[PDB]
């Protein structure tokens, strides 16, 4: 068959769906990776075949989708939400990109078309040629959760005061396409979810669950990493967190490096500078493939990202995780800590001092470790890419 | 399980095993890609896990292995080509590399081993660690074919007239890694097959075999193949070849554009100046996507390789080659003529009439599209990419304690 991805330019977002892509293509189905041409070179570069739409985007240059506190949540906080998110997405795949995605789709005619899950071209391009398509998810489903709760309360109201953001602007998006509003439009004729389901949000219709793969780009095995470890090691992955906040980024790195460990740090070339002579048990690196260092390490400290967390949970590693709230990171860093798999440190509370001691915890105390493979064990147990496959076969089938 | 895959630094055989590589990874193994550091690129740019193994190889900086006249088959011939293809193929999967590679398979301890057929660092990587290891094809088992008339007329000499430079070979490599010759050394565990089983030679082992997935490269589809094609098209992969042989290579240009069809050719930059004017049909490019290009083609001309001719099986395209014999191509070229889904025109015969008449008929005559399509329904009914794993599972499962 013939699978339509789409995504924004991006490369975190593309990341989400390589692996998926790719069980695609050996399953024998043609794949297009439809995105801006500013991300062209980075799908190429995973091994795909791009589509380039649109212009180049450039993303990189009180109203929060994830306000969970349950007064917060009225029907004018959450309407307000969508009135400024659909802003924001329509910009992210605009008039140009969408026209671009849905004359490519009716030219190709493909049977499935799968939208990353702020890519709101692809179920335009979708209904525009009458394929069902599968919004794809690269966390937990804040705007899904938000739009339940929209949906029953706008409900209830006078019929004449249910002013819709969401139906106004994808009615706007599909109509130069010939493409009614349909609540399908916003969420898709199915969604496919990358979180776990113990982490993830009640929702209302089932979302198919996944085992997610988390890619993580270009991948080179350094040589010091074919070293057995002569003792734990850990893996620091809070570069942007730390240069963003008396106390130096050396202050850091030195209360971090105090633990009976081996620490590998991912750092800018500007920051290796600031931090000065590293502690004898620091290895400064630009980037490391997370899952080729991973299988060596008692603990990861890190912003909480999709990516990084799935990876901890694949190879069963204890987290200490700095919620950067950007997503969902806080929601999901609350839940591993519920868990017994992490131990969390907001920004505003973040110390040298705090870091260092959470980090000696995760070693020391044998839960930690016990609660990740845990978690990991369940994870293994979702459906494999391979069962992922037949399930959209099935969508695909169905119309 | 973990898959410790190994190729020496060549694109062509890289790609050859990415798409299993994937199938592997996306049902959940671990899968490690080593090759000399000169192919890691290559390696990340198909969204691979390299390990780099060895030093840097670059390989583009009377003896073969197509040779099937009966005549010439004799022990002395074998033997001598087995002497010599062992001194190239160390050269190519040289001490360092084999270290290398028998490092990481002690540190990181796979539970499969899947090796390119000419990368002998592989095999040896496997034995130290008791891990069975899959030969992997990338066109016919010349090797293998040779291989087993080797073995059959040694069988029958004088027992003090049975050299085996493939034995020395190996049990040399071996040795610094405790790693004793065995025939399992140089032909695998078992053999993963990529050429589909009609057109195989006959083995006195089994092969798996497997709907192969020819994987193409990088590729961003261009604006001008993502438009509705106006009439029919034919595929011309053969620059290479052509810039090789008073008969111009602008005149090979102009009788195979002489057809009722737009051409898309592939020729390099040096190629496009020295034919000039193209004719008005032709549209010169220095690469395209085949899976992009062929659903809408009705012939392609090439110089026979695997992954092209793969690429021709996949979409049930009529063939014109002109055979290359880098391998398997010659021999290749006749099965598909026999069975009616290509013409040939060996390098000797070649005149521009000749490789343009061909084209016609296969354009013309609707014979060849019904043989194509014919070959690609048997095609795609081998052993799925999932289904290989599987397979491959059991290797690994069967092949332990
Ligand atoms: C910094 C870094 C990221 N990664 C991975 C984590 C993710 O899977 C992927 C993309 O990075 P990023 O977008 O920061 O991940 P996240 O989803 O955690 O925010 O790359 C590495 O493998 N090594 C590295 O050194
Ligand atoms: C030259 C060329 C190759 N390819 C594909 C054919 C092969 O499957 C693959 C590897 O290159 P190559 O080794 O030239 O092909 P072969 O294996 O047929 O000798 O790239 C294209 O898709 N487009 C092109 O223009
Ligand atoms: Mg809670």
Same mark, same amino acid.
């Given at each position: 068959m013939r699978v339509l991805m789409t995504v924004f330019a991006n490369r975190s977002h593309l990341y989400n769906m390589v692996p998926l892509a790719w069980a695609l293509t050996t399953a024998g189905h043609e794949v297009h990776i439809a995105s801006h041409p500013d991300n062209v070179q980075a799908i190429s570069d995973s091994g795909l075949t791009a589509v380039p739409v649109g212009n180049? %985007? +450039?993303?990189?240059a009180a109203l929060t %989708? +994830?306000? *969970?506190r349950p007064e917060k949540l009225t029907w004018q906080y959450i309407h307000d939400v969508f009135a400024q998110y659909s802003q924001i997405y329509e910009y992210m795949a605009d008039s140009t990109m969408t026209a671009d995605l849905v004359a490519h789709a009716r030219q190709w005619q493909p049977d499935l078309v799968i939208w990353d899950? %702020? *890519?709101?071209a692809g179920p335009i391009a979708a209904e525009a040629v009458g394929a069902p398509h599968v919004r794809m998810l690269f966390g937990l489903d804040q705007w899904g959760r938000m739009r339940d709760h929209f949906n029953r309360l706008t409900g209830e109201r006078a019929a004449d005061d249910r002013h819709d953001p969401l139906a106004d602007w994808l009615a706007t998006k599909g109509e130069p396409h010939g493409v009614a509003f349909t609540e399908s439009l916003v969420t898709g004729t199915t969604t496919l979810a990358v979180a776990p389901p113990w982490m993830s949000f009640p929702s209302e219709q089932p979302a198919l669950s996944m085992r997610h793969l988390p890619f993580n780009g270009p991948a080179v095995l350094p040589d010091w990493l074919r070293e057995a470890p002569s003792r734990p090691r850990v893996c620091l992955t809070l570069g942007l967190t730390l240069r963003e906040l008396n106390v130096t980024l050396a202050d850091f790195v030195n209360a971090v490096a105090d633990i009976d460990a081996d620490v590998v740090a991912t750092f800018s070339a500007e920051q290796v500078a600031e931090i000065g002579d590293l502690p004898d048990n620091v290895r400064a690196v630009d980037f490391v493939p997370l899952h080729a260092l991973?299988?060596?390490?008692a603990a990861i400290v890190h912003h909480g990202g999709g990516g990084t967390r799935t990876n901890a949970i694949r190879y069963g590693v204890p987290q200490l995780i700095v919620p950067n709230w950007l997503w969902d990171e806080g929601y999901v860093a609350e839940r591993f800590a519920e868990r017994g798999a992490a131990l969390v440190t907001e920004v505003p509370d973040l110390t040298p001092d705090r870091l260092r001691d959470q980090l000696r915890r995760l070693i020391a105390e044998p839960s930690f470790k016990a609660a990740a493979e845990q978690i990991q064990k369940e994870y293994d147990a979702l459906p494999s890419l391979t069962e992922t496959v037949g399930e959209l076969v099935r969508v695909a089938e169905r119309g």
């Open positions: 180049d %985007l +450039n993303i990189m %989708l +994830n306000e *969970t899950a %702020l *890519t709101y991973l299988p060596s390490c």
